[PDB]
């Protein structure tokens, strides 16, 4: 007894810390930069949609104005 405390504690004392650091690094890398880039891309597409909407609205208002 009291000799399995080493073999159940020291293991996770380093392996768990290193593995969680690895998980955090990979999750941040996968998540943050890709999300910001994708949001910028969607913003550009949204601006293009806004331009198309403005053009169509203006041309239809020009024709229909009677």
């Amino acid at each position: 007894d009291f000799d399995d405390i080493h073999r159940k504690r020291m293991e996770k004392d380093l392996n768990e810390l290193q593995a969680l650091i690895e998980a955090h690094f990979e999750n941040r890398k996968k998540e943050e930069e890709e999300l910001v880039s994708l949001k910028d891309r969607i913003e550009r597409r949204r601006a293009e949609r806004a331009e198309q909407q403005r053009i169509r609205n203006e041309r239809e208002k020009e024709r229909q104005n009677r």
């Binding site: 007894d1 009291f2 399995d4 405390i5």
Partner: protein, 371 residues
């Protein structure tokens, strides 16, 4: 086959198969009947939501715990809780599995006898054994001596053990626990304007207590600091908005543990009942008990309690002895981990109360040699 290590507790039922690291299913032990009328037809409305289901529909229920202080006050609800635990959270029929319940020290006999009678007649288990909640917490620490303070949610008890020989004359059981701290916090929150009354809002106050409260290292200095600066005021968002700000209620709620005069209890705090429990022991094992003080149970998870308790005991104890407080990070499930270890032992395999033995001596078998 494998054994079922159930642990009734009072506030959270923890269960799982023997031989693992953590309980498989942990869920509050509340059974709440609906209280309003109900107009939708065919909605499939049941008559009682138990376990974790009633913590999501708690807006229209009247939750009521079936275990008050260790003892069980409402046997039908407890039977319902056990049935749910076996069939829906573990999905193993009890006809093929031994069970290992846990019970607080110094509890009424009738409670234990009724528990074994239920387990043998209704659920019809092959064999069940009842163990004291502190010996298991001592198993989990991997020790064999030490005095364990198991401050659960129902009752706080302090069982000293040396070399495997428990000292029955030195058990100090005190009925202040997490539930009384919840009620006292709910009572002192009214000093700022927030009124929680419904039995559903007791859960919200419990969440506030868990997430914000902490034990002060020195009480008077904290009371003076919180009354001048504002560095302590932490805010918290209710289940509907309207954030609240807790001031010096943060460390006043768990201070009740060390000064039970706050809620009107006469007895001394958990810092002095441990010293009294030690002093009742023999003069030659006091050093070992001083050096191996063990904490367990949920309520001992307050941030900063393992230092306050050590400071208090060092103040009380003689100056030469070394005071050490074992506070493992897996405190909450310490009793259940110990239960799993005990159920996994080969030497223990012949201590179960076999069903034929119960058939021959009745429910009073539990007080006999098979303890």
């Amino acid at each position: 086959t494998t054994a079922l290590v159930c642990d009734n507790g009072s506030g959270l039922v923890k269960a799982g198969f023997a031989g693992d690291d953590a309980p498989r299913a942990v869920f509050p032990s509340i059974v709440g009947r609906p209280r309003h009328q109900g107009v939708m037809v065919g909605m499939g409305q049941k008559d009682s939501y138990v376990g974790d289901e009633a913590q999501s529909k708690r807006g229209i229920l009247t939750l009521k715990y079936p275990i008050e202080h260790g003892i069980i006050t409402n046997w039908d609800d407890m039977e319902k809780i056990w049935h749910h635990t076996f069939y829906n959270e573990l999905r193993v029929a009890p006809e093929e599995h031994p069970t290992l319940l846990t019970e607080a020290p110094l509890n009424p006999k009738a409670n234990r006898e009724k528990m074994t009678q239920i387990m043998f007649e209704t659920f019809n288990v092959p064999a069940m054994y009842v163990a004291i909640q502190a010996v298991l917490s001592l198993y989990a620490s991997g020790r064999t001596t030490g005095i364990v303070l198991d401050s659960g949610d129902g009752v706080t008890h302090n069982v000293p053990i040396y070399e495997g020989y428990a000292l029955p004359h030195a058990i100090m059981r005190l009925d202040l626990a997490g539930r009384d701290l919840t009620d006292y916090l709910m009572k002192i929150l009214t000093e700022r304007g927030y009124s929680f009354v419904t039995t559903a809002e007791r859960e919200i106050v419990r969440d506030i207590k868990e997430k914000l409260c902490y034990v002060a290292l020195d009480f008077e200095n904290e009371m003076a600091t919180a009354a001048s600066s504002s560095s302590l005021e932490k805010s918290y968002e209710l289940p509907d908005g309207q954030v609240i700000t807790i001031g010096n209620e943060r460390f006043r709620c768990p201070e009740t543990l060390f000064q039970p005069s706050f809620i009107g209890m006469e007895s001394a705090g958990i810092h002095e009942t441990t010293y009294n429990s030690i002093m009742k022991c023999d003069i030659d094992i006091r050093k070992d008990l001083y050096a191996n003080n063990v904490l367990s149970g949920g309520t001992t998870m307050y941030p900063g309690i393992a230092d306050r308790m050590q400071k208090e005991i060092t103040a009380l104890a003689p100056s030469t002895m070394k005071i050490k407080i074992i506070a493992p990070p897996e405190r909450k499930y310490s009793v259940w981990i110990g239960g799993s270890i005990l159920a996994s032992l080969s030497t223990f395999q012949q201590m179960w109360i076999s069903k034929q033995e119960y058939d021959e001596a009745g429910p009073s078998i539990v007080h006999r040699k098979c303890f």
